Write a protein that binds this ligand. Structure first.
Ligand code: ADP
Ligand code: ADP
Ligand code: MG
Ligand code: MG
Lengths: 371, 172, 371, 172
């Protein structure tokens, strides 16, 4: 039987089959409900919209994300999305297909326990297994050593792994990701008179961020250049035909990744988080981890992010060490590819959690067999 | 029986629909309302796992998510007296609602559905599933009377007023 | 020299001298122009009317508000408003007085830039300063800790301040204020056959709302009572001698503040906005922010609003916290009182934007010496 | 003159203030920046004792911590000719700042202080100590022209974009 590697993220649901190279279905993880009163007989009959439909009809819907900060908070919507991604997108019958899921480190135990309970009771899957997102991202990169900085819509976590060993005491997490960047962009776009308050307008701002933002090599040099001429200004087209123009806001929005104090967070920037993470590893390992920085995730797709991260870490790292950022072109789908590789290995077949084991111990069993 | 159950402070606020949709042509008042109470009744992690597992089974048989599950509950509940098992299973759910810390907020939500959407249209011959939930929220049992409405037919204070626009076009 | 305080709010304009207890001039912020063709020669007609003069002759004028949602749309009208405020109500010479201004938080920066430029060129003021209305509101109440909910004619915003330190990332802003309530009442009044469409009749609806509206402690309980008897009915006399009677419209119109979805807005009610703003601050300052709610502005003069706010916040907050809502009887002029207090403090005299500074820096100086 | 002097790697990172507090109404940017500079210049243990003591004395006499000492020093920094031999120690200190391995990071910190807090306000009439520190950090003297701020009055890319909320309450 073929495994269904299904990655659930804060922003996007990446699903597919084991052994493939690319996911087959990628739709945003949103659920939409109407907010205006219908008047036409027939027509509107659905109480909820999921996936691309909720994205297409966003003019008349309120969109809620079931996942925030990588922790599921609305379980009914999550169950709805799981049903959709199995019966209407991959065209499969979960009863005859083992499934693989993903979860960020340092999550509440109840989240994973519930997830196991839902998977074995509302879907009757043959087997399941929850793997750390950063760990899977390393399988796709074809390495056994290196530190992984997986940042997407929910969290930005670092997990160093050396020679098939993960040092858990150096795992760090930060609830600063794409959604926080979108909120900051919405906050600063009001400096130019553009107001976005509704959920659909939040999606529009998110699209602007994806299509116009970039990370500056020198924040100061860039702000000075933007304030000297109009070279950095660009124009974006709203869906109703109005045109907006953004100047320094293009690179101030992703600067929050390097200066979390912009959004009022006391925590350090990602470069300093990575530097602290390696320094908690044993002194004999730091050299290999300096030279295998592997990035993966939607927030890791801002153009120029690799150069800024390399510059900052080299500023922090010792002079004699070599710093090498690895940013593969498919780092948006690194986690899914790594999951497909893991589910397709022969030795991994002894690590599934089957229904017989589930019934004996209960969801709890998931802590024992999964890292 | 279900001692040690705690709930989130305010988590059902994200389930109530807009007042507008509450006037929509095919708005399901019963199904959505049972959704609001169910999201409120979701146990918090602070509850011990043996206690939490017990309540989740109770919510899985009286306030489900799938449409067919609620449809089957609506069918066999007409002559509910033939199933004594559900009568006790429904009562133990009612006593939990009465002690909900946010009962006052949930009481207002029920009345908002009744006046705007029409949740209490039957005003005494409901499904007996919606009855206990309302009875748990407000114990006086006054929702069966029906929501009082204001009638503009009588007009004690009818005041025909010729404003700016109405004065450009009249008769006699 | 004597300082001038000018609070150019959306609906009314408050002006006076620093060190006073009350404003000396308060007139509506409306500019009116004739809409009918003149026939009698000799009396003379001005092309426009400003302030109370435009109110008296409103039967032959169209009244245009120069300020909409807190942002100055029409600048020529605002220039005429300031001309009036300086030469016909306070009877002062601008060059011989430092003037202070107010601005709603999170407004476009072009607004304050043009304000500074206009005051430093057209009127040649020796010194000026732009303050945030919530901060002045907190000065007026003699407190240094608390959360300010200033709800005026165009903007309703929250600004939490602790020990003289503000938290900008927790500041909320909602474009739901008195003018939207007036529009909603104008729409609802058509249910009883009363139709008001002209700009002059908008003012009459505003007076009805001022003199006959109140916020119900229990909305559903109040609606039932007004549908059962005629206790809540009251009658208002139109300027032409006709009489109108309004029933449950009295407490439905202000309810938009707590249920914005009535007028089609997706935002949450002002109680929920205040709770969200409090919750975004640090955990160690929430106890003090719960117990120092300060309301100010015209929209907070509906009878019973304080009790409804206290009830809603207590319903939202944890039980063990103490909720105290502070509603001073002179809260309609809290912003101006605070502005008068700030201009009369010795330490503040070093913070003026002198003409010299503006000349050297340019209208951009408003973004440095002002918050 | 200080052959063998060494420092730590990121000892000064814990002193850089938050950007939010950097806009405080009563923020004294000069004291914070000099404190950052001093903390970056603290010698390490591996430095030989005589050199370490000499450099500690130099830092103490040129960059003190007491507010009264800093004010007294700034009083006589207006005229350096009336106090000879002060430039010699000042030049000796300014020499070692350029040889700091963290020159780039320190220069970026100074640039951030300029744009956010307003470190270079006099931009040509600043005090001797701060000007010399800035000259040591950046050798081109480009901090005297100002942070080159931006004016949102050029009106270049505004469209009065009517969004969802702005569509409701609008005139003409
Ligand atoms: N090319 C891009 N540039 C900038 N941001 C992007 C890009 N592509 C995706 N994103 C952002 O990354 C976020 C999450 O992407 P992803 O890594 O798939 O999240 P998850 O890991 O939760 O599935 C989205 O919110 C999206 O806005
Ligand atoms: N007694 C009252 N009852 C209800 N609303 C009032 C009352 N007094 C004033 N208002 C409202 O306050 C608004 C203006 O108040 P104010 O805060 O001074 O506006 P601004 O801040 O724009 O000057 C008016 O639009 C009016 O509707
Ligand atoms: Mg991810
Ligand atoms: Mg005001």
């Amino acid at each position: 039987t073929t495994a269904l590697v299904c990655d659930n993220g804060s922003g996007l649901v990446k699903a597919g089959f084991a052994g493939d190279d690319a996911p087959r279905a990628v739709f945003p993880s949103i659920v939409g409900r109407p907010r205006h009163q219908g008047v036409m007989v027939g027509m509107g009959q659905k109480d909820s919209y999921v996936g691309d439909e909720a994205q297409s009809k966003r003019g008349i819907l309120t969109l809620k994300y079931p996942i925030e900060h990588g922790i599921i908070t609305n379980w009914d919507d999550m169950e709805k999305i799981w049903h959709h991604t199995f019966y209407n997108e991959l065209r499969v019958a979960p009863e005859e297909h083992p499934t693989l899921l993903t979860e960020a480190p340092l999550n509440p135990k109840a989240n994973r326990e519930k997830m196991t309970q839902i998977m074995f009771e509302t879907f009757n899957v043959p087997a399941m297994y929850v793997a750390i997102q950063a760990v899977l991202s390393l399988y796709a990169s074809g390495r056994t050593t290196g530190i992984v900085l997986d940042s997407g819509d929910g969290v930005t976590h670092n997990v160093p792994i050396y020679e098939g060993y993960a040092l858990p005491h150096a795992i760090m997490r930060l609830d600063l990701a794409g959604r926080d960047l979108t909120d900051y962009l919405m906050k600063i776009l009001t400096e130019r008179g553009y107001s976005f308050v509704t959920t659909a307008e939040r999606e529009i701002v998110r699209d602007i961020k994806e299509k116009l933002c970039y990370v500056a090599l020198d924040f100061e040099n860039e702000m000075a250049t933007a304030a000297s001429s109009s070279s950095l200004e660009k124009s974006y087209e709203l869906p109703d035909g109005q045109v907006i123009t953004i100047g320094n806001e293009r690179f101030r929005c992703p600067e929050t990744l390097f200066q979390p104090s912009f959004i009022g967070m006391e925590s350090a920037g990602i470069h300093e988080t990575t530097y602290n993470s390696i320094m908690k590893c044993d002194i004999d390992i730091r050299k290999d981890l300096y030279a295998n920085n592997v990035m993966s995730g939607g927030t890791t797709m801002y153009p120029g992010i690799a150069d800024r991260m390399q510059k900052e870490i080299t500023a922090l790292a010792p002079s004699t060490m070599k710093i090498k950022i690895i940013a593969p072109p498919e780092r948006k789908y690194s986690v899914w590819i790594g999951g497909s590789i893991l589910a397709s290995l022969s030795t991994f077949q002894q690590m599934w959690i089957t229904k017989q084991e589930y019934d004996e111990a209960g969801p709890s069993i998931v802590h024992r067999k999964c890292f | 029986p279900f001692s040690g159950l705690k709930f989130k402070q305010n988590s059902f606020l994200s389930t109530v629909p807009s007042v507008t949709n509450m006037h929509s042509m095919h708005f399901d008042a019963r199904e959505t309302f049972l959704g609001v109470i169910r999201k409120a009744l979701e146990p918090d992690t602070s509850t011990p796992f043996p206690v939490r597992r017990a309540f989740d089974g109770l919510r899985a048989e009286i306030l489900p998510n799938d449409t067919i599950k609620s449809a089957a509950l609506k069918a066999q509940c007409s002559d509910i007296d033939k199933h004594p098992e559900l009568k006790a299973k429904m009562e133990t759910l009612k006593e939990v609602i009465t002690h909900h810390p946010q009962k006052e907020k949930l009481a207002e939500i029920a009345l908002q559905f009744a006046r705007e959407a029409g949740l209490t249209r039957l005003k005494g011959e409901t499904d007996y599933v919606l009855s206990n939930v309302l009875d748990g929220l407000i114990g006086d049992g006054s929702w069966r009377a029906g929501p009082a409405y204001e009638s503009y037919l009588n007009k004690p204070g009818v005041d025909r007023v010729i404003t700016t626009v109405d004065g450009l076009h009249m008769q006699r």
